[PDB]
C-alpha cells in the first residue's frame, strides 16, 4: 500500500527514531525502536517512501496504536 499505516504490536515505550522525520525509507527498513519487557523491538517500514511519525519519542503506546505513515514520494 502507498500509505502503510502500521499499528503497534504491544504496549511499550518508543525509545529512538532511527530515521529523521520526512526521510525516505525503503521496504523492511527500521524507522523506530520499541521497548517492552526490557527487550528492544524495532519497527520496520513496509514499503518505500517518506516516513512521518505520529507518536512522540520517549513516550508510551498501546495495543494496535498507529505509529507512522509511509507516503510514496514522487
Amino acid at each position: 500500500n502507498g500509505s502503510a499505516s502500521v499499528l503497534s504490536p504491544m504496549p511499550g515505550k518508543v525509545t529512538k527514531l532511527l530515521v529523521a522525520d520526512g526521510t525516505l525509507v525503503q521496504q523492511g527498513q527500521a524507522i523506530l525502536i520499541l521497548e517492552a519487557m526490557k527487550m528492544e523491538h524495532v519497527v520496520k517500514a513496509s514499503c518505500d517512501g517518506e516516513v512521518k511519525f505520529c507518536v512522540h519519542a520517549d513516550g508510551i503506546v498501546g495495543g494496535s496504536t498507529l505509529l507512522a505513515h509511509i507516503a510514496s514520494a514522487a
Binding site: 521497548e35 519487557m37 526490557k38 527487550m39 528492544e40 523491538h41 524495532v42
Partner: protein, 542 residues
C-alpha cells in the same frame, strides 16, 4: 511478456538473482557493529587462551607433573590423541574446559580426561583417554560424568570406543559423589557391556595403571592392550594386599604386562611402549569388519557460504545488558550454510521462530532458530516443522536465543501452554539426529522447547557469549525484588545487584562447560565446521 522464464532458471541463477539466497551484508562502518565485533573478538581470544593454557599447562605443579610423566616414557594425552588418529584428520574434542573452577583448590584440567571423536583408518571412533597428570588420573565426579557422556554419544552414534587407560581410580575424598549411584563409576562398565552386546567395539589400551573398579575397563573390553613398563591391572593394589595378608609385592609383579599377557589372559596384546600400543590400537581398528559406507553416493557438490563467518560477531549484541537488543538470526544462518541458501518454512506465520531447510557440505538439515519471544503461533510452527523433518529423516539444527514465552491473560487463555507442550512433545519424541547451539540466551521453559540438554540432542555447544539460566538475570532480579516483601526499600539495589551477579556467574559459558551441561564452547566462526563434524558422526547411527 508474461511468464517468459522457467522456474529452473531461477533455481540455477547467480547469487544476486537466486531467490532463496539470504543477503545480509555486514554494516562494517556502523559503530554498534564495531563494538559487537570487539566484544566477540575478546571473548574468542579468552576462549583460545584458556584452551591453550590447558594444553600447555600454567602452574609449576603442572610442569613438575608433566616432567614426571615424560620421564616415565609416557606420551601426553593430547600427544597420544595426535599419534593415534590419522595424521591429517579432524578431531572433535568435546569437553575442553570441563572442571574449570569446579572444585576449589584443584586445577582439574579437562576434568582429568580427554574425550573426542577421531578418525582411525577412515572410520570415526570415540576416544577416551585418562590424563595421568591431573591428580594421578583419579576420577573426580566430573571425570565420571564426562566419561559417561562420551560413552552415551558413542552408543547412540555407534562409534567404536577406545579407552586409553591411565588412572589411579576413584578419589576417596569425594567417594560419595563418585562410587554409589546410577550415573556413577559402575555405569561406565554397564555402558561398556551393553555397547559390546550391541556390536559396538570396545577397545582398551592400558598405558598406565588401572586399580580396583577401573580394572574392569580392560577386562570388559572386546580387545585390550597393556604396555610393558607402565601397564598394571589389579583389583587389589599392593597397599591392600599388604594390609590384608602382610605381603609386599611390586605393582609389576602383581598386575604387570607379563602376568596379564602370558598367564592371566586378561589382555590380548603386549605393547613395548606407548608408540607400539597406539600402533596395536590402529591395527585393532583396522580389523573391525565395518563397511566403509552403506550408500556409496558422495553428494559433495556444495558451495561455501557467500558471507565470511568472521563477521558473525558483528551481528551479536551484548547479551548481558539492562535492555537486550534484538537481531535477525538469518544473518547468522547466511554465514553457516551452503551457498547462503535457505528455504524458509512459514516466513509470515511464526515471525519469531525461523524454520527452514539448508545444507552443510551437501547434507540436508532443518534449522529451527529463535528470533524473538515465543508465541502460540511460533510454537505450533516449530512443532509442525519438527514433525515434517522427522517424517523425512532430516536432521534438526536448533539455534537457541530464547527468553521465555509471551505472558498475559489473553495468551494463557489462547492455550500457549498447550502449544508449547506440542513443540516439546515433537522435539522429544523425534528420532532424527538433533544438534543444538546456544548462540544467545536459553531461559526457562523456552529452553525446553528448543531441544535443551534434557531432550537428548546428539551434541550441544555454546558460544562464548551465551548464557543459560532458569530465567534472565534482569528478570530474576525484578521478580525476586517484587516477590520478596520482607526486603526493605533501603536494600533494593544491593539485592538486585547481588542476584544479577549470581545469575551472571552461574549462567556464563564457562560455568556451564565445567559442569558438562554442554559439549564444549566453540567460536561462532568455527560453528559451521563443528556442525559438519557432528553431522558426520551421526552418519553411522542406525
Amino acid at each position: 511478456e508474461v511468464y517468459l522464464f522457467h522456474p529452473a532458471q531461477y533455481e540455477s541463477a547467480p547469487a544476486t538473482t537466486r531467490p532463496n539466497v539470504l543477503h545480509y551484508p555486514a554494516e562494517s562502518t556502523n559503530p554498534e557493529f564495531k563494538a559487537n565485533t570487539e566484544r566477540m573478538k575478546a571473548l574468542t581470544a579468552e576462549l583460545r587462551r584458556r584452551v591453550q593454557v590447558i594444553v600447555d599447562g600454567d602452574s609449576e605443579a603442572d610442569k613438575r607433573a608433566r616432567d614426571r610423566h615424560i620421564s616415565r616414557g609416557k606420551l601426553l594425552v593430547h600427544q597420544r590423541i595426535e599419534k593415534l588418529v590419522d595424521p591429517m584428520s579432524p578431531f572433535l574434542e568435546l569437553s575442553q574446559l570441563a572442571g574449570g573452577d569446579l572444585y576449589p583448590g584443584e586445577a582439574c584440567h579437562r576434568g582429568g580426561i580427554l574425550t573426542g571423536i577421531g578418525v582411525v583408518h577412515g572410520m570415526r571412533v570415540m576416544i577416551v583417554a585418562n590424563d595421568a597428570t591431573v591428580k594421578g588420573g583419579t576420577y573426580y565426579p566430573i571425570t565420571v560424568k564426562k566419561h559417561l557422556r562420551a560413552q552415551r554419544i558413542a552408543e547412540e552414534n555407534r562409534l567404536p570406543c577406545i579407552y586409553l587407560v591411565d588412572s589411579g581410580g576413584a578419589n576417596l575424598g569425594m567417594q560419595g559423589d563418585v562410587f554409589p549411584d546410577e550415573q556413577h563409576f559402575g555405569r561406565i562398565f554397564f555402558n561398556q557391556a551393553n555397547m559390546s552386546a550391541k556390536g559396538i567395539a570396545q577397545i582398551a589400551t592400558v598405558m598406565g595403571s588401572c586399580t580396583a573398579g577401573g580394572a574392569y575397563v580392560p577386562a570388559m573390553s572386546d580387545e585390550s592392550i597393556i604396555v610393558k613398563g607402565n601397564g598394571t591391572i589389579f583389583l587389589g593394589g599392593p597397599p591392600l594386599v599388604f594390609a590384608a595378608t602382610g605381603e609386599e609385592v611390586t605393582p609389576e609383579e602383581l598386575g604387570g604386562a607379563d602376568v596379564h599377557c602370558r598367564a592371566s589372559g586378561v589382555t590380548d596384546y603386549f605393547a613395548t611402549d606407548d608408540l607400539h600400543a597406539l600402533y596395536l590400537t590402529r591395527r585393532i581398528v583396522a580389523n573391525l569388519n565395518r563397511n566403509d559406507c552403506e550408500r556409496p553416493c558422495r553428494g559433495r557438490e556444495f558451495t561455501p557460504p557467500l558471507y565470511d563467518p568472521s563477521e558473525i560477531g558483528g551481528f551479536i549484541p551484548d547479551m548481558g545488558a539492562d535492555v537486550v537488543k534484538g537481531f535477525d538470526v538469518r544473518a547468522v544462518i547466511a554465514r553457516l550454510v551452503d551457498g547462503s541458501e535457505f528455504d524458509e518454512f512459514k516466513k509470515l506465520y511464526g515471525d519469531t521462530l525461523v524454520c527452514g531447510f539448508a545444507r552443510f557440505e551437501g547434507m540436508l538439515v532443518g534449522i529451527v532458530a529463535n528470533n524473538g519471544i515465543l508465541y502460540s503461533e511460533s510454537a505450533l510452527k516449530g512443532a509442525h516443522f519438527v514433525e515434517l523433518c522427522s517424517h523425512r529423516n532430516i536432521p534438526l539444527l536448533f539455534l537457541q536465543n530464547i527468553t521465555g514465552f509471551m505472558v498475559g491473560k489473553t495468551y494463557e487463555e489462547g492455550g500457549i501452554a498447550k502449544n508449547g507442550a506440542k513443540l516439546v512433545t515433537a522435539v522429544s519424541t523425534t528420532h532424527v539426529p538433533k544438534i543444538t547451539i546456544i548462540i544467545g540466551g536459553s531461559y526457562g521453559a523456552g529452553n525446553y522447547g528448543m531441544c535443551g540438554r534434557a531432550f537428548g540432542p546428539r551434541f550441544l555447544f555454546m558460544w562464548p557469549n551465551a548464557r543459560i539460566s532458569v530465567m534472565g538475570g534482569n528478570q530474576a532480579a525484578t521478580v525476586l525484588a517484587l516477590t520478596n516483601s520482607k526486603l526493605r526499600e533501603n536494600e533494593v539495589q544491593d539485592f538486585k545487584a547481588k542476584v544479577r551477579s549470581k545469575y551472571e556467574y552461574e549462567g556464563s559459558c564457562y560455568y556451564s562447560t565445567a559442569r558438562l551441561w554442554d559439549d564444549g564452547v566453540i567460536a561462532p566462526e568455527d560453528t559451521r565446521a563443528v556442525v559438519v563434524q557432528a553431522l558426520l558422526s551421526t552418519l553411522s547411527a542406525p
